[PDB]
Symmetry: C7
Subunit: 237 residues, 7 copies
């Protein structure tokens, strides 16, 4: 797709920590915009585990391929994929990472993953009201299996968090989300799950035909995360 | 020693702290707006306990149902339900939770619930005047039975707190409240109370006919809180 | 005589700290407005004590009656009634409560009540010039009997303080104040004092006929404060 | 591709800690306005002491008379009288008080009163330049006998201090000062001194005929301050 | 970018930490501009190492030649080059230096270079959201061989980081990046690699014919960095 | 929403720590203006010492004459005279005083007076750049005899310091400085020196004829400062 | 003109730490201007040393000649000359002096003079980005001989530093720099070096014919600095 920023003027500039007369945080709103322009990714609970899949859209030959990993591990049993401002995502991810370690070193085990996400969420929410500082313009989803079972959560710049059966984020959210909204199959076995997924991913962003090379990872109850190899993903491609 | 935040290294530019020529905190007003756009919930004292009921309006098949719990526990004998900016509600809930724990660990027992709400209220009141920081865009109600007996309180973004015999909050407040204002029956036994309630909740938000699946829980003097199961609630539905 | 510096800069660009070209603090003025929009109340010295009386105007049946106490106790011998921003009023009261305890624990006795009011006044005054922080939108009057005798003080958002023989505050101030200004009887015995008072309160806010249920408390030299029970006040009503 | 002095003068931005292009601190100017609107008072050295006198203009019968003391003791040998924002005045006075005690506990004796006033003035001067904070809107005069002998000083919102033979402050300054400037008698004996003063006070504010009840206090070398009782003052009245 | 830019004042930027209504950080944008106006430089992986090359464009005879080193060493095994605000670049370079030592002293060895750059990047990222502080108007590329093997990354004012097979930075970025994008040869042996590079650099900035004297350095797996001598560089020139 | 309020806007910026497009600090300039409107004073090295002389322009009879000292001692061998904002002068003077003592207590002797001034000068220079603070609106001249010999220095609000043979400051600076500029006699003997001075001072400010009573003091190498008595000065007058 | 200000401009676009849409720091730019309006000075490496030369332009006979030293020592082997805001220059110089002592006291010897300048540069650079603080309006050049040999560096308000063979600064920079740029002789022996210099300085600022009295100092490898005496320079003049 063609790229270019026609707008270069500051234009309208509200302020920070100010509700609009209609009860809205415009800054948090503008933040959301940034994440809409991000890459597209999704994940869904299946058989006895959960998978993650993102559209790895590459440009130059000169990029170090794989090095542009979109799906990142926070720990062997839990990962997250993100979209929006790259820098903000990164730092936010590292926070989750250490945060995860903390619970492990104090309680001896990350029993409930829901909690890990709540913390990073709270981090984000702080910037939503604490005066002099810019909100994190990134949305990300955590998924993996904890003591309770296979889990999937998403988080937006406002610090909002929810649990899904399946969901997506980034540019093609609306599209891909609708596809699942209709064709999502409950206890779909992995092989088919990834299929339904890649299909859904396709339809969405695939206004531009070529799906390119998606990045896919999955974890099933009982064991650690598995990242699909170039060939394995291409198989479903 | 004085209670306050040591962190003050960060400089603050713009800040909320201006009374209008007519004696009003516009920021706190704008905040109130955000809560009106929140879901609808209510509660009321009855026979020998109190109950809480929230309208659990769901969208996608892809959401993890129950996980979107609106009625949250503070402790086995006190629960609260909130309305407004979701993020703000969550963080304000956890504050009350630990704050609750604190009274328990020093005094050995949370004797007066009124006090619990007062603390969380004051928290909110602080952002009402301390310059550089956006107020909490949320309102909530605490319900439970304490040393004094079944108690019902509500709280707005201004930090204003009041005890009720029955009340509501969120979107259809004015509506549902009027129904009760009219048909509220003093010592209505639980079964009939939950009914009157659900009826009241219906009328209000029910401009859109379908009541969907309401979330209801109750507690009665002498014991801990009881969350109604899917079928039980569907029974009154 | 060396002294360390916690903050490198004494202060930066902040609001709420500007004299109008005519020598007035407009914010403090606007703050006063909000208090004008509060409930009406008054107090007056009599025979050998002082009494406080406030108009308890109630709305819904759903309100927990008494729980909406306007006359508050700071200590068995000193009570205060407030008008203006409710949240602000509360927080200010608690400050006065602990502050009272403070003098007690150090000197072993609250010898002069004037001093207690001065301390809470100063608290208010600070927000009058210390930049980034909104003034307390509330006024209140303290009454009780100290080492000197029965005492009646009032205090506005400015932090201004005066001692009266009789006075009122809130919405119907100018009105009720005129009434006393005219028909206030110096050493009026209690029964008659409460009469003159209630009559005064009535005349004032009673543009709307029904006085409703007034909240009244009285203390006399030698003993602790006495709050009037529903029937007793209704007797004068 | 060219630079020059396009703007002769810089446009006005804020107002706190900003010199006007004519080298004036407008804020401090406005402050002064506030003091013009305050009550009128004066003081003058006499035979072997100095005296203070302030116009105690009372309104309602409901005010606790004397309690509205305008002349305030800093210590048995030094008093002060104030004019301007009443709250600001009070807090400043107490500062003067603790400060006076400070010198006494370290040096064992307040040898030179000039110093005392120097410290309070420096207090005010600080608010004249330290960014975020509104200046004290008040002007006061200190009088009392010290190691050097009877002394009289005045202080304005700018932190300016001077010693007079006689002077005044408040509303009718210009008027009263002129009267003295003309008929002031060098070593006038107390009785005639207080007369010359009350007359001077009269003329000034006495556009409105009734001098009402003045407040007068005096000290003479060798002993402690004396406040005139109602009858005594009424005698010169 | 042509110097024919339109001169103007500052935009309507209230403070640095505002998202535009389109989800963009304008300040970070403006910073990027500053980098485009810097010198041109590049680097690329080759045979068994990596090389760096920057256009050392000199003016006066009075400059101390070599002293204007654009290629700087962070450690014998890692170098970096920069473009944009010189001052910002330098400070940024030293941080990286000390940062590198720290890793060395705690772990005993700089195992993965990606981490080093990550640290310097997060530094910049901070100034992207933390209020009162101007972002680093600079972009730099780190290159050298670590535990994994030869590595090359780039970093911009936004703190965004990527690893390349080859890439450039500064003024003629777009031009030279294209050249390589087309004629870049995978495992090109040093001598030819430096040639392809110098040709690419030439083409790019060489609108003004003379390539002048380029600054080039290269390291290979197994040993320390080697900076080319004047004569050696002139050989490829 | 929005009843109709939108005309008024809230915003805060800077205008003190801001260079003009032409390279000048408007605030410091404005500061200078304030000093121009101050009293006129001068000083000049003579035979074997230095003398200071200020025009003590008095108004009302009610002022305490001498107490309005314009020439102030810093230590028995060094004095200074100031002009500009009275309040800022004083505080600044005291700073020099303790600053003087400091060197004495550490090195045992104030060897070089030039250093003393540099310190008070730096204090001033600091407020020229440190944001949130209004510069000192004053200029002064330091004179006395140090280890090197008789010295004379001047200092302005900007923190600029120069040593002179003779100079003046205040209102009629330009005038008096010119008279000297022409008729200044190098090693003029005291009696004549004070004459040349008074003459020079006269001419300048003497557009208004009457020189009134000048304040003069002089010190000569080998001993302490001498302040001229009313009659003595009157002799040259 | 009036108590009320006609302009309601609460804030303006001009501020600090803001990149312009074209990537420039306007504040740093304006700072440069002020250095342009400063005196003119230069330096150049010669035979086996380096020399400094500044135009000591004097006004009144009343100035203390030599006392206005423009060339200042940091230590017997390194001196610097500055141009721009005098006050800023001074404090900046003292910083480098103590800064030098620091290295000497820790390492036992100032090995590389480049480091010294770099430290003073970073100090400067900080005010380039740390929000609330005006940048240093001054540039200076350091010259001396260190462990590497004779060295010459220049430094601007931006914190940019460069080593030269010869250079100048201040008002007539461009002028004198060109002269050198053309007639500068590499290993010119001192006597001739100073000549080429004085001639160069002359040509430049000498639009006004009279070169007045130039201030010149030089050092040669192997020994300490030598400042030329009035007559010696007059010999070259």
């Amino acid at each position: 797709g063609a790229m270019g920023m026609q707008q270069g003027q500051m234009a309208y500039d509200r302020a920070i920590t100010v509700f609009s007369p209609d009860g809205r945080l415009f800054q948090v709103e503008y933040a959301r915009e940034a994440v809409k322009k991000g890459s597209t990714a999704l994940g869904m609970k299946f058989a006895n585990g959960v998978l993650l899949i993102s559209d790895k859209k590459v440009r130059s030959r000169l990029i170090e391929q794989n090095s542009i990993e979109k799906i990142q591990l926070i720990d062997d049993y839990v990962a997250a994929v993100t979209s929006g401002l790259v820098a903000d995502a990164r730092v936010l991810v590292d926070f989750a990472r250490i945060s995860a370690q903390q619970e492990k070193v104090t309680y001896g085990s990350l029993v409930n993953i829901e909690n890990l996400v709540k913390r990073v969420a709270d981090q984000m929410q702080q910037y939503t009201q604490y005066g002099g500082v810019r909100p994190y313009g990134v949305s990300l989803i955590f998924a993996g299996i904890d003591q309770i079972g296979p889990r999937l959560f998403d988080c937006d710049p406002a610090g909002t968090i929810n649990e899904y059966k399946a969901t997506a984020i980034g540019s093609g959210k609306d599209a891909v989300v609708s596809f699942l909204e209709r064709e999502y199959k409950e206890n779909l076995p992995e092989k088919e799950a990834v299929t339904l997924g890649i299909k859904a991913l396709k339809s969405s962003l695939e206004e531009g035909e070529e799906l390119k090379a998606p990045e896919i990872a999955s974890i099933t109850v009982g064991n650690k995360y598995r990242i699909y190899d170039q060939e394995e993903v291409k198989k479903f491609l």
